[PDB]
Structure formats: C-alpha cells, structure tokens
Amino acid sequence: KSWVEETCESIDTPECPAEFESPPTLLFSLDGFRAEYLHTWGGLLPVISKLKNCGTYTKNMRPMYPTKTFPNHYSIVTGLYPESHGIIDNKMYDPKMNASFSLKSKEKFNPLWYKGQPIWVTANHQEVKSGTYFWPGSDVEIDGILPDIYKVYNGSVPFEERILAVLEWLQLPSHERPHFYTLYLEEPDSSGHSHGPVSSEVIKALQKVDRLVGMLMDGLKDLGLDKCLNLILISDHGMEQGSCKKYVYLNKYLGDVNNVKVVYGPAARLRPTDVPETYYSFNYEALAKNLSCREPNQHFRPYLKPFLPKRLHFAKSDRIEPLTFYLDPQWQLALNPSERKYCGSGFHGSDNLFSNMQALFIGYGPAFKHGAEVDSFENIEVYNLMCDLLGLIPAPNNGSHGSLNHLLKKPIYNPSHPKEEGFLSQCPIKSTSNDLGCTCDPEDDDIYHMTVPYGRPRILLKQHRVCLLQQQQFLTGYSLDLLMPLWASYTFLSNDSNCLYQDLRIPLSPVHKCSYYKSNSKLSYGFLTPPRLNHIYSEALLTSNIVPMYQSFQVIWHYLHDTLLQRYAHERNGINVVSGPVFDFDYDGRYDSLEILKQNSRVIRSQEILIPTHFFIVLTSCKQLSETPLECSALESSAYILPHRPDNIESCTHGKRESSWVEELLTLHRARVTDVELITGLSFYQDRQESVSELLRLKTHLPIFS
Numbered sequence: 023k024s025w026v027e028e029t030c031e032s033i034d035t036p037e038c039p040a041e042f043e044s045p046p047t048l049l050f051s052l053d054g055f056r057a058e059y060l061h062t063w064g065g066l067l068p069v070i071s072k073l074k075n076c077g078t079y080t081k082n083m084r085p086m087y088p089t090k091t092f093p094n095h096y097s098i099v100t101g102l103y104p105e106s107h108g109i110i111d112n113k114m115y116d117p118k119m120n121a122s123f124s125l126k127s128k129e130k131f132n133p134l135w136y137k138g139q140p141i142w143v144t145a146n147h148q149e150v151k152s153g154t155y156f157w158p159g160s161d162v163e164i165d166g167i168l169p170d171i172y173k174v175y176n177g178s179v180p181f182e183e184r185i186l187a188v189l190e191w192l193q194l195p196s197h198e199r200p201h202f203y204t205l206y207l208e209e210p211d212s213s214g215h216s217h218g219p220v221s222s223e224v225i226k227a228l229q230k231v232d233r234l235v236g237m238l239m240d241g242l243k244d245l246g247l248d249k250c251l252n253l254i255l256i257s258d259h260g261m262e263q264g265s266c267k268k269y270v271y272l273n274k275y276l277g278d279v280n281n282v283k284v285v286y287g288p289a290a291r292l293r294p295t296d297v298p299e300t301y302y303s304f305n306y307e308a309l310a311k312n313l314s315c316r317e318p319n320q321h322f323r324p325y326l327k328p329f330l331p332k333r334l335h336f337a338k339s340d341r342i343e344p345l346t347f348y349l350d351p352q353w354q355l356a357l358n359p360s361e362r363k364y365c366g367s368g369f370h371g372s373d374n375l376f377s378n379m380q381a382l383f384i385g386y387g388p389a390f391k392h393g394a395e396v397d398s399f400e401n402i403e404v405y406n407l408m409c410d411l412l413g414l415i416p417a418p419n420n421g422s423h424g425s426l427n428h429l430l431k432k433p434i435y436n437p438s439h440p441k442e443e444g445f446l447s448q449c450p451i452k453s454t455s456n457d458l459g460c461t462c463d464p465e466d467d468d469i470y471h472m473t474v475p476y477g478r479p480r481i482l483l484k485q486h487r488v489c490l491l492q493q494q495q496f497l498t499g500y501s502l503d504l505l506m507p508l509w510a511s512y513t514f515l516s517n518d519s520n521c522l523y524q525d526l527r528i529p530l531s532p533v534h535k536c537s538y539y540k541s542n543s544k545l546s547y548g549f550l551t552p553p554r555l556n557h558i559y560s561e562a563l564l565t566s567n568i569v570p571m572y573q574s575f576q577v578i579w580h581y582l583h584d585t586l587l588q589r590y591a592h593e594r595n596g597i598n599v600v601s602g603p604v605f606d607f608d609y610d611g612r613y614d615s616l617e618i619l620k621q622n623s624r625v626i627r628s629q630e631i632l633i634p635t636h637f638f639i640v641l642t643s644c645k646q647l648s649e650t651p652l653e654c655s656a657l658e659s660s661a662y663i664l665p666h667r668p669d670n671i672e673s674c675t676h677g678k679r680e681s682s683w684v685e686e687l688l689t690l691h692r693a694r695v696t697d698v699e700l701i702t703g704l705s706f707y708q709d710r711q712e713s714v715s716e717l718l719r720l721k722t723h724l725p726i727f728s
C-alpha cells in the first residue's frame with residue numbers, strides 16, 4: 023500500500039532509523055499555489071489532502087509584498103521583510119550600484135543583492151549540513167557560505183529527477199548527510215500564468231504536482247522515513263486572473279514619454295530614465311500629484327514610498343522606487359502596451375491581503391500536530407519555526423519568535439514579554455496657573471482597571487520619560503521629553519469647540535494655548551479621547567489630551583469617533599480604545615530616536631512643533647458578544663495606522679461622499695497590533711490572562727480582503 027492509500031498515524035514520538043539522531047526538515051515549495059486551490063480542488067488532490075488532514079494546516083498563509091517568487095521565497099528562509107533582505111521584486115534596480123536585477127541575468131548570482139541571513143547560512147554557522155535544490159539564494163553565496171549540497175537553477179530539469187535527487191541525499195553517511203532540505207517546482211505558477219487560475223491546465227498541473235508529492239511520500243516510506251521527517255509544504259504567492267479591459271497605461275496621462283521607466287505589474291514602480299543622475303533629482307511628488315484622481319473610479323493610486331500603508335513594510339530600501347502604485351484587485355499598471363508581456367494572462371503581485379494572493383502552508387511530521395487547523399500567519403514567521411525544527415539559534419528577523427508554537431506538539435522556544443525600558447515617573451500639581459485664552463460656552467484602583475482592563479501599555483522606549491495621568495474616563499501615558507501624550511486608553515460601552523482646560527500636572531507649552539490656533543492655518547489640535555463621552559465630559563478637554571492635527575485629518579478623525587466608533591460599540595457590545603501619535607520620519611517602521619526626532623521638528627506659527635506622521639488606534643472587544651470589554655474571555659483586536667496628511671488627495675474626496683471614502687481609508691490602513699507596537703515602542707495586553715505565545719498570535723493577525 024502506497025503512503026496516500028494508508029490512513030492517518032499519530033507520530034507523537036519520532037521513529038527514526040539508525041544513523042539518524044533527529045528527524046530532518048524538508049521545505050517543499052509549489053510556486054503559484056494559490057490558497058483557494060486546495061479549498062476548492064481538495065477532492066482532486068488526494069496526496070495533498072492527506073497531508074492536510076494528518077498535519078497542521080491553515081486556510082490562508084499571508085505572503086510578503088509584492089507577491090512575487092523571489093521576494094517571498096527569500097523572505098521565508100530569512101524571516102525578513104523584502105525591504106530589509108534586498109530582494110524587492112523579480113525585476114528591480116539598485117541606484118547605488120547602477121545595476122539592474124533579473125531572474126535571467128548575470129546580476130542574479132551577485133551576492134551584493136542578497137542581504138540578511140538565509141537558513142542554510144544559519145545552519146552552517148552552527149555546524150548543521152544543508153542540501154538544497156533550486157531555492158532562490160541557493161545558487162548565490164551569501165557571506166561566503168554555500169549549502170553543502172546545491173544546484174544552480176535549471177528549469178529544464180524534470181520534476182521527478184528533483185525528488186529522486188533529494189531522496190538520494192537522504193541515504194548519505196550520517197556525517198555527510200544534510201539535516202535541512204529544500205525542494206522547488208515551477209507549478210502551478212507556470213500553468214497559472216498561461217491559462218488562468220480557473221482552467222483545465224491548472225487542474226492538470228495541480229494533479230501533476232499532487233502525484234509528485236505522492237512520489238516523495240512513497241519514496242520516504244521505502245526508506246523508512248515516513249515517520250521520521252518534518253515536511254513543510256509551502257508556496258510563495260497566489261494567482262489572479264488578469265484582463266485586457268482591466269489594465270492601466272501611464273501614457274494616457276503622460277504621453278509617449280521616454281524620461282521615465284515603469285516596472286510593470288499590479289505593484290508598479292517608477293524611476294527616471296536618466297539614472298542615477300536624476301534618481302533623486304527627479305521630483306516624484308509632482309508626478310504623483312499629477313496622476314492622482316484622474317478617473318471617477320480610478321483602479322490605481324500614486325503613492326510616495328513612505329505614504330504606502332505601513333502594513334506592507336515597503337519603504338526602507340534603496341532598490342524600492344520613491345514612486346509606487348497601489349492597484350485594485352485584478353488590475354495591472356504599465357507605461358505602454360508594448361512593455362508588458364501580456365494583459366489577459368494569469369498574474370500575481372497584488373496586495374498581500376487579497377484573497378487570491380494567499381499562499382499554501384502544510385506542516386507534517388513528528389514535530390507537527392495531526393489534523394490541527396490554525397489561523398492565518400505571515401511567511402516571515404516560518405524562519406523561526408525552522409530554527410526550532412533544526413535546533414538553531416535564529417538570526418535577528420521580523421517574525422515574532424514563538425508565535426507559531428501552537429503548530430508543534432512540544433514547543434522548543436517559550437517566549438516572554440518585553441521588559442519596560444521607559445523611565446516611568448510621576449506628575450503632581452506643580453505649575454498654577456496660566457491663562458489659555460479660550461472661550462467656553464456653558465477608588466483610583468477601581469477606575470484604573472476600568473480604563474486599561476487588559477493592562478496598561480508598557481513603554482519599550484529607552485529611556486523615555488513617561489508619566490501616567492489618571493482621569494475618570496481614560497488613562498493617558500504622557501511624555502515629558504516630547505510634552506505630548508504617547509497613548510490614551512479608554513472604554514466605550516454599548517450605550518453610554520475652541521475651549522480647553524490647563525492640565526496642572528504637565529508643564530505648560532505655548533502650543534497648549536488656544537490663542538496659538540487660528541482659523542486660517544490648516545494645522546490645529548485633535549483629541550485622542552473624544553470629548554462627547556458620557557452633559558459633556560470636561561477632562562477630555564485637558565491640555566494633556568490634545569495632539570497637533572491637520573484640519574483635513576480632523577474630517578477623518580471626527581467621523582471615526584462620531585459614526586464608526588459608535589456603530590462598532592453596538593456590533594461588538596462595546597469597545598476598548600487605545601490611540602496615540604506616530605513619529606516615523608525615516609519610514610523604517612520603527613519608532614524614531616530622540617536624535618532624528620529633533621531633526622524633523624518643524625516650526626509653525628512662531629513655535630516649534632513635532633508633528634505626527636501617523637496616528638494609531640487599537641480596537642479591542644470580546645470574541646463572545648455577550649461580554650463587555652471589561653469581562654472578555656478571549657480578545658478581538660483590530661488595529662489601524664492612519665497616515666497624517668495635510669490633504670485628502672489619497673482619498674479623492676471630490677464628489678463629497680464622506681461616509682464612503684473614510685471607511686475605505688480605514689480598511690486600507692489596517693495593521694497588525696505588532697506593527698503598532700513596532701512603530702510606537704509600546705507593548706499591549708501584557709496583563710491579559712492568555713499566554714505570551716497566544717498574545718503574539720493575536721497581535722500578528724490581519725484580516726483578508728474579499
């Protein structure tokens with residue numbers, strides 16, 4: 023009986039043949055295996071289905087941005103964001119090197135492109151042999167290290183020979199036998215491009231790939247290793263059906279110009295022709311503003327590199343163009359109809375939260391649980407997972423180490439909460455009492471736990487000075503070094519102008535007085551906590567509850583609290599809200615140091631002001647609608663990192679449909695709670711009853727569009 027014909031067997035304890043000390047780990051990749059494939063065509067894939075049913079499976083695995091082979095395949099083995107590991111796209115360009123990059127190019131084998139540290143390099147430093155086969159980055163030597171067994175990429179090599187090649191390596195002597203293995207197949211990406219996600223060719227391809235895995239599993243059984251190997255069946259991205267009618271050509275707005283170069287696809291980027299002479303000299307801001315809102319329902323959007331949604335993490339690299347394009351699903355962008363390969367072919371590269379961009383992940387073996395279905399996770403988390411499977415100390419990556427502990431029978435690494443680096447001090451009443459020049463028209467422990475029911479945010483800033491200001495409706499962590507609130511937490515239940523009051527607990531700043539704000543300047547103040555809480559709550563009008571805010575952003579901020587926040591309180595039976603300013607001027611996704619903060623502090627209206635680049639907001643509720651936010655058994659989080667812009671060009675307000683464009687901005691700039699943690703230097707939910715590993719799972723979560 024073949025392996026696929028046998029039923030499930032619990033591998034609680036690894037059954038390894040002699041000469042084996044611990045079960046090896048094989049990483050099997052199927053390029054272009056969209057997550058929807060297994061959902062729908064499970065009955066046509068008997069081998070893959072058994073691996074799903076006897077292992078740990080996830081409906082959707084979220085890939086990196088853009089959704090391309092090389093960036094994702096390399097992010098898997100490095101656990102790094104594409105903006106950090108160097109491989110931004112299949113085709114890209116580095117200004118500092120004056121060289122282009124391509125799959126079919128001599129520059130591909132250049133070690134100057136590959137940054138970070140792949141797993142086989144990690145394994146080599148800790149005396150662990152690795153045998154790879156056609157994995158991106160295996161051909162090139164990184165840090166002067168090459169895998170003990172490698173093969174330079176040759177797509178003409180038949181798949182069946184690749185499987186046998188790995189099977190032959192498994193028979194090598196214990197000292198010359200690798201402990202880590204990789205496998206790569208071009209299907210069903212190839213069939214996906216040429217015929218589309220819904221075709222007879224992909225079904226034949228899925229079945230072809232399915233029998234090939236069955237060949238591997240039968241091969242493992244004949245070697246007596248079917249219960250002695252950790253298998254990770256993964257993919258790089260999904261596949262979307264392209265259309266000729268749904269394609270964007272830049273020439274229609276610019277003309278047959280030759281001063282600009284466009285990297286075509288659903289994740290388009292633009293650089294000038296005179297490069298690197300005018301790579302920075304070219305002002306992209308003008309071109310971006312000239313391309314925005316040209317159509318009634320435009321299916322593309324010009325984005326300056328820092329203005330992209332933070333969830334994408336696609337800014338802090340030299341290779342990423344300062345001008346990018348975000349497109350609606352099923353849409354691609356190009357300069358001229360001649361540059362593109364084809365318009366009506368199967369494509370990928372769209373937003374990594376799109377439904378069809380989702381990838382496959384199945385973990386099978388003695389180390390993985392049997393028939394366990396887990397929630398979605400990013401591919402950068404897999405790197406740390408493999409280190410635990412190979413007994414390796416992981417290189418510094420972007421994955422929350424330990425967040426995938428629920429997949430394993432016996433977790434190797436037990437995570438802990440980050441220590442508080444902030445210098446926590448107290449603010450008593452000391453300075454009374456200045457005139458604000460404002461016109462106004464006519465115990466403690468119980469109120470603390472009510473405002474921060476999951477625990478106060480911990481200050482990971484080192485070594486920032488923060489005070490805790492307690493009110494009757496909210497608790498705010500105030501910064502003494504910046505003289506503004508870092509965060510404000512409050513609970514809003516299911517059913518419950520030009521004036522301000524001086525908070526005598528904080529030192530007075532000239533920007534706290536209402537006389538500072540005129541009706542002419544676009545810059546004003548906003549509240550972190552809405553004043554319309556519970557008559558009218560006056561402590562929300564404290565000076566310590568205001569932040570510098572553009573008038574254009576107040577349109578979004580007021581609608582967020584007056585309409586959406588109240589609706590969410592009814593749908594989710596109350597919500598706990600934590601809000602605050604975000605300062606990331608170097609657009610690296612992490613909080614700025616005091617040094618760079620002083621460099622970006624503008625002066626306006628004769629006063630020095632540090633104005634926020636973004637504003638974060640975390641909404642927390644109960645998973646059980648019968649419970650209020652003060653009595654949750656399990657949490658329901660959703661975070662947002664909203665861009666603080668002087669105008670609403672991104673939204674195309676023109677047409678004046680306010681209730682529509684705001685929510686579309688909210689949904690677009692949704693982010694992981696971890697993302698907020700990384701960018702604000704705060705740590706949430708530390709006093710929550712669930713374990714650290716569970717809390718990492720919660721904080722690294724993002725919803726899939728469509």
Ligand SMILES: *[C@@H]1O[C@H](CO)[C@@H](O[C@@H]2O[C@H](CO)[C@@H](O[C@@H]3O[C@H](CO[C@H]4O[C@H](CO)[C@@H](O)[C@H](O[C@H]5O[C@H](CO)[C@@H](O)[C@H](O)[C@@H]5O)[C@@H]4O)[C@@H](O)[C@H](O[C@H]4O[C@H](CO)[C@@H](O)[C@H](O)[C@@H]4O)[C@@H]3O)[C@H](O)[C@H]2NC(C)=O)[C@H](O)[C@H]1NC(C)=O
Binds near residue numbers: 700
């Ligand atoms: C995802 O995960 C990845 C990996 O964990 C994160 O990427 C890492 O980000 C951090 C912070 O952004 C990076 O650290 C910085 O590295 C840069 C670059 O290093 C080089 O910079 C100069 C080259 O021209 C040069 O000055 C440096 O030379 C030495 O510098 C000092 C001298 O004493 C020494 O300590 C170094 O070891 C070097 O020998 C170097 O060649 C660097 O500029 C940064 O310096 C800042 O911080 C230091 C204090 O640490 C300070 O002194 C400086 O003034 C400056 O403020 C900093 O070290 C790191 O390189 C990234 N790692 C990788 C592999 O990419 C990423 O942050 C995560 N992303 C997200 C979104 O979370």
Ligand SMILES: Nc1ccn([C@@H]2O[C@H](COP(=O)(O)O)[C@@H](O)[C@H]2O)c(=O)n1
Binds near residue numbers: 092158177
């Ligand atoms: N190491 C590797 C792995 C894949 N590739 C190529 O990358 C292609 C996949 O790219 P996309 O999915 O991004 O379009 C495969 O068809 C293959 O020919 C390569 O050139 N070198």
Ligand SMILES: *[C@@H]1O[C@H](CO)[C@@H](O)[C@H](O)[C@H]1NC(C)=O
Binds near residue numbers: 120121297298
């Ligand atoms: C950059 O590369 C191009 C193409 O090879 C070359 O013609 C040009 O001379 C290079 N520019 C610089 C500054 O080296």
Ligand SMILES: *[C@@H]1O[C@H](CO)[C@@H](O)[C@H](O)[C@H]1NC(C)=O
Binds near residue numbers: 176178179
């Ligand atoms: C690629 O692989 C095929 C199949 O093994 C082989 O015939 C061919 O010679 C290889 N091409 C190159 C360039 O090595």
Ligand SMILES: [Ca+2]
Binds near residue numbers: 606614
């Ligand atoms: Ca920063």
Ligand SMILES: [Zn+2]
Binds near residue numbers: 091092258
């Ligand atoms: Zn691919």
Ligand SMILES: [Zn+2]
Binds near residue numbers: 054091211212370
């Ligand atoms: Zn592809």
